[PDB]
Design a protein around this nucleic acid. Structure first.
Length: 49
DNA sequence: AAAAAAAAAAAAAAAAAAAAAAAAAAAAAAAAAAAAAAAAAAAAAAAAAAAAAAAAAAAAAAAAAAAAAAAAAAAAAAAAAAAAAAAAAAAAAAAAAAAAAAAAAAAAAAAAAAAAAA
Protein backbone atom coordinates (compact mmCIF):
# COMPACT_ATOMS: atom_id res chain seq x y z
CA UNK A 1 0.00 0.00 0.00
CA UNK A 2 2.65 2.63 1.05
CA UNK A 3 6.51 2.46 0.82
CA UNK A 4 8.27 5.48 2.47
CA UNK A 5 12.05 6.03 1.83
CA UNK A 6 14.74 6.28 4.61
CA UNK A 7 18.36 7.43 4.04
CA UNK A 8 19.83 5.98 7.24
CA UNK A 9 18.14 5.12 10.52
CA UNK A 10 19.05 7.32 13.49
CA UNK A 11 18.64 7.47 17.25
CA UNK A 12 15.48 9.38 18.17
CA UNK A 13 13.78 9.47 14.74
CA UNK A 14 10.11 8.65 15.36
CA UNK A 15 8.17 6.93 12.58
CA UNK A 16 4.65 8.25 11.77
CA UNK A 17 1.89 6.05 10.20
CA UNK A 18 -1.67 7.03 9.10
CA UNK A 19 -4.51 4.79 7.73
CA UNK A 20 -7.31 5.53 5.29
CA UNK A 21 -10.00 5.18 7.98
CA UNK A 22 -8.84 8.35 9.77
CA UNK A 23 -6.74 6.60 12.42
CA UNK A 24 -3.06 7.31 13.10
CA UNK A 25 -0.16 5.89 15.16
CA UNK A 26 3.43 6.99 15.79
CA UNK A 27 6.22 4.42 16.19
CA UNK A 28 9.94 4.53 16.95
CA UNK A 29 12.19 3.85 13.96
CA UNK A 30 14.70 1.90 16.08
CA UNK A 31 12.29 -1.08 16.05
CA UNK A 32 12.78 -1.29 12.24
CA UNK A 33 16.58 -1.44 12.10
CA UNK A 34 17.12 -4.89 10.52
CA UNK A 35 14.13 -7.01 9.48
CA UNK A 36 15.79 -9.61 7.22
CA UNK A 37 12.65 -10.44 5.22
CA UNK A 38 10.76 -10.26 8.50
CA UNK A 39 6.99 -9.84 8.27
CA UNK A 40 6.71 -7.79 11.46
CA UNK A 41 3.26 -6.33 12.04
CA UNK A 42 2.68 -2.64 12.84
CA UNK A 43 -1.08 -2.17 13.31
CA UNK A 44 -4.18 -4.24 13.96
CA UNK A 45 -5.90 -2.63 10.98
CA UNK A 46 -9.62 -3.00 11.70
CA UNK A 47 -11.83 -3.79 8.73
CA UNK A 48 -10.65 -2.88 5.23
CA UNK A 49 -8.16 -0.04 5.77
C1' DA B 1 20.11 -84.34 -39.67
C1' DA B 2 20.32 -78.85 -41.32
C1' DA B 3 21.06 -73.84 -39.62
C1' DA B 4 22.76 -70.52 -36.11
C1' DA B 5 25.49 -68.72 -32.38
C1' DA B 6 29.31 -69.01 -28.30
C1' DA B 7 33.81 -69.90 -27.00
C1' DA B 8 38.82 -70.59 -27.33
C1' DA B 9 43.43 -70.32 -29.33
C1' DA B 10 47.49 -65.37 -30.50
C1' DA B 11 49.18 -60.91 -32.27
C1' DA B 12 46.80 -56.20 -32.97
C1' DA B 13 43.54 -51.53 -31.94
C1' DA B 14 41.60 -48.78 -27.80
C1' DA B 15 40.01 -47.90 -22.91
C1' DA B 16 38.48 -48.10 -17.24
C1' DA B 17 38.92 -48.26 -11.49
C1' DA B 18 39.82 -48.89 -5.90
C1' DA B 19 42.90 -47.29 -1.90
C1' DA B 20 47.10 -44.30 1.30
C1' DA B 21 49.18 -39.99 2.94
C1' DA B 22 48.19 -33.97 4.66
C1' DA B 23 45.82 -29.41 4.11
C1' DA B 24 42.63 -26.52 2.30
C1' DA B 25 38.00 -25.55 0.64
C1' DA B 26 32.99 -26.35 0.03
C1' DA B 27 28.17 -28.71 1.22
C1' DA B 28 25.12 -30.15 4.51
C1' DA B 29 23.30 -31.21 8.63
C1' DA B 30 22.88 -30.20 13.64
C1' DA B 31 22.54 -27.02 18.90
C1' DA B 32 21.56 -22.70 20.36
C1' DA B 33 21.07 -17.32 20.75
C1' DA B 34 17.74 -14.28 19.31
C1' DA B 35 13.74 -12.08 18.11
C1' DA B 36 8.25 -12.38 16.17
C1' DA B 37 4.05 -14.08 17.69
C1' DA B 38 0.47 -15.46 20.87
C1' DA B 39 -2.26 -16.16 25.67
C1' DA B 40 -3.50 -14.14 29.81
C1' DA B 41 -3.25 -10.40 34.03
C1' DA B 42 -3.74 -5.13 35.37
C1' DA B 43 -3.96 -0.91 34.02
C1' DA B 44 -4.94 4.41 31.75
C1' DA B 45 -5.71 7.81 27.24
C1' DA B 46 -9.86 8.50 24.40
C1' DA B 47 -14.79 9.01 23.43
C1' DA B 48 -18.49 10.51 25.49
C1' DA B 49 -20.98 14.24 27.21
C1' DA B 50 -22.32 18.96 27.99
C1' DA B 51 -22.20 23.93 27.94
C1' DA B 52 -20.18 27.70 25.86
C1' DA B 53 -18.14 30.23 22.12
C1' DA B 54 -16.28 33.05 17.86
C1' DA B 55 -13.72 32.15 12.54
C1' DA B 56 -14.68 31.43 7.87
C1' DA B 57 -18.42 30.64 3.99
C1' DA B 58 -22.09 34.14 1.99
C1' DA B 59 -22.84 38.35 -0.27
C1' DA B 60 -21.75 43.13 -3.07
C1' DA B 61 -18.41 44.05 -7.01
C1' DA B 62 -13.91 45.53 -9.48
C1' DA B 63 -9.95 43.62 -12.19
C1' DA B 64 -6.27 40.93 -13.44
C1' DA B 65 -4.50 36.41 -14.52
C1' DA B 66 -6.55 33.58 -17.52
C1' DA B 67 -8.14 29.33 -21.39
C1' DA B 68 -9.89 29.47 -26.22
C1' DA B 69 -8.55 31.08 -30.96
C1' DA B 70 -4.94 31.72 -34.49
C1' DA B 71 -0.52 30.55 -36.33
C1' DA B 72 4.10 28.38 -37.02
C1' DA B 73 6.94 24.72 -36.37
C1' DA B 74 9.26 20.28 -33.75
C1' DA B 75 9.01 15.82 -33.54
C1' DA B 76 6.85 11.93 -29.04
C1' DA B 77 4.07 7.96 -29.76
C1' DA B 78 1.52 4.13 -32.44
C1' DA B 79 1.19 0.26 -35.37
C1' DA B 80 3.69 -3.02 -38.36
C1' DA B 81 7.84 -6.09 -39.23
C1' DA B 82 11.32 -9.02 -36.70
C1' DA B 83 13.93 -11.17 -32.80
C1' DA B 84 14.53 -13.05 -27.58
C1' DA B 85 12.80 -14.53 -22.47
C1' DA B 86 10.21 -17.07 -19.76
C1' DA B 87 6.25 -20.12 -18.30
C1' DA B 88 2.03 -24.43 -18.63
C1' DA B 89 1.08 -28.86 -21.30
C1' DA B 90 2.10 -33.21 -22.02
C1' DA B 91 4.84 -37.27 -21.84
C1' DA B 92 8.57 -40.06 -19.68
C1' DA B 93 10.97 -42.40 -15.83
C1' DA B 94 13.70 -45.13 -11.39
C1' DA B 95 12.72 -46.91 -7.21
C1' DA B 96 9.51 -49.98 -5.35
C1' DA B 97 5.68 -53.25 -3.87
C1' DA B 98 4.21 -57.68 -5.90
C1' DA B 99 5.01 -62.27 -7.73
C1' DA B 100 7.67 -66.65 -8.98
C1' DA B 101 12.00 -69.94 -9.07
C1' DA B 102 16.24 -71.87 -6.84
C1' DA B 103 19.61 -72.85 -2.37
C1' DA B 104 20.04 -74.73 2.49
C1' DA B 105 18.21 -77.36 6.49
C1' DA B 106 15.61 -81.20 7.73
C1' DA B 107 15.06 -85.63 9.67
C1' DA B 108 12.56 -91.37 8.13
C1' DA B 109 14.58 -95.08 6.89
C1' DA B 110 17.93 -98.33 4.51
C1' DA B 111 22.57 -99.93 1.81
C1' DA B 112 26.89 -100.56 2.56
C1' DA B 113 30.51 -100.70 5.56
C1' DA B 114 33.35 -101.45 9.96
C1' DA B 115 33.98 -103.86 14.08
C1' DA B 116 33.69 -107.48 17.46
C1' DA B 117 31.36 -111.94 20.16
C1' DA B 118 31.29 -117.00 20.78
Amino acid sequence: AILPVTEFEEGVKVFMATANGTVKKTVLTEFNRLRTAGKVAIKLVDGDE
